[PDB]
């Protein structure tokens, strides 16, 4: 098996630059559960909360534009549409609510989940919604007629994170039974199963280019090729548990938010971890409240936005000095698995 270990010593992967802390934005009353960014102009955020609201923050200066109320309970997920001026928010109240960005009033309510719905993802080309939650089923909603067109029977437990892809498998799903399924929706059954995770897969992210996915677990962040469904790579992780979210820059940088408050940055190609940071909790907070609930990159990918459990949004910027003087991180030493 050593031949593989030599083949890990030839590459010397992929230098990148570190990250640092540009800006701190308070202003939520409760926790920040979810964050999404305007896919076109990059001019703002939509941030869920634990206070039921949604507060639309300006990306440029960080000022607060507007407040979108209307959920009775905490908002687990928010997703903004590309081709549409629509905003689909979803909560623990068992409802997926549409939002017309133009006039800022609820348009449609989609009905028929048994219990809280923790993920919405907007299929790129079909005018569909994909919702999922403690139902343990994935519902493909027809955006126009509010008809739960397709239901995907599936994982043996709740469904944490769901994504959409234009070609085959059009829905990737991740559940607390510690599997990740690659779905074929037209026939309505699993195309491929990926079991390699040992515990709940709490987050996924789609690489904007290579047509792959990064899947998470407690201590091990893996990657997966879509299409064939192979494993692609691994990412070197000592115990980071727990991984709340992942985000993939367009430069092939793979972010990992910790529940220990550590921000684990990776290269996507290699699996190498070139940086790990630690956030400052807050003025009056508790050391338990330091963690990262969600995160995203803008359309460019030169800034990072992380909602934290301390009731604050933080904006992490990529250092411009860097280069070879001293960037170098942990420097690519891998222990035998």
């Amino acid at each position: 098996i050593v031949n593989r270990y030599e083949k890990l010593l030839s590459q010397r992967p992929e230098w990148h630059a570190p990250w640092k802390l540009s800006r701190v934005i308070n202003g939520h009353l409760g926790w920040v559960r979810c964050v999404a960014i305007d896919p076109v102009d990059n001019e703002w955020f939509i941030t869920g909360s634990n206070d039921t609201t949604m507060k639309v923050w300006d990306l440029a200066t960080g000022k607060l534009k507007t407040t979108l109320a209307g959920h009775v309970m905490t908002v687990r997920d928010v997703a903004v549409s590309d081709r549409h001026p629509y905003l689909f928010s979803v909560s623990e109240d068992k409802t997926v609510k549409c939002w017309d960005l133009e006039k800022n009033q609820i348009i449609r309510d989609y009905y028929g989940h048994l219990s809280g719905v923790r993920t919405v993802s907007i299929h790129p080309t079909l005018d569909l919604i994909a919702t999922a939650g403690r139902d343990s089923v994935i519902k493909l909603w027809d955006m126009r007629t509010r008809i739960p067109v397709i239901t995907l029977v599936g994982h043996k437990g709740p469904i944490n994170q769901v994504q959409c892809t234009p070609v085959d498998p059009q829905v990737v799903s991740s559940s607390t039974d510690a599997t990740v399924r690659l779905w074929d929706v037209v026939a309505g059954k699993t195309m491929k199963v990926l079991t390699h995770h040992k515990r709940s897969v709490r987050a996924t992210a789609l690489h904007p280019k290579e047509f792959s996915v990064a899947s998470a677990c407690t201590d091990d962040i893996r990657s997966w090729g879509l299409a064939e469904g192979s494993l692609l790579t691994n990412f070197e992780s000592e115990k980071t548990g727990i991984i709340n979210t992942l985000s993939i820059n367009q430069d092939d940088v793979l972010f990992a938010g910790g529940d220990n408050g550590v921000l684990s940055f990776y290269d996507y190609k290699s699996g190498h971890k070139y940086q790990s940071l630690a956030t400052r909790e807050m003025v009056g907070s508790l050391e338990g409240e330091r963690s990262v609930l969600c995160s995203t990159f803008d359309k460019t990918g030169l800034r990072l936005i992380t909602g934290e459990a301390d009731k604050s949004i933080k904006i992490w910027k990529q250092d411009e000095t860097a280069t070879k003087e001293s960037e170098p991180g942990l420097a690519w030493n891998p222990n035998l698995s």
């Binding site: 590459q11 290579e210 792959s212 990657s223 090729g225 299409a227 494993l231 692609l232 190609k269």
Partner: peptide, 26 residues
């Protein structure tokens, strides 16, 4: 008879493919 017993599982599913060559393009 080795073929029959575990016939489903096999090793190469455990091993990651990108570690051979990075930049292998999907």
């Amino acid at each position: 008879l080795t073929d029959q017993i575990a016939k489903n599982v096999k090793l190469d599913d455990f091993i990651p493919k990108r570690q051979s060559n990075f930049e292998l393009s999907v």
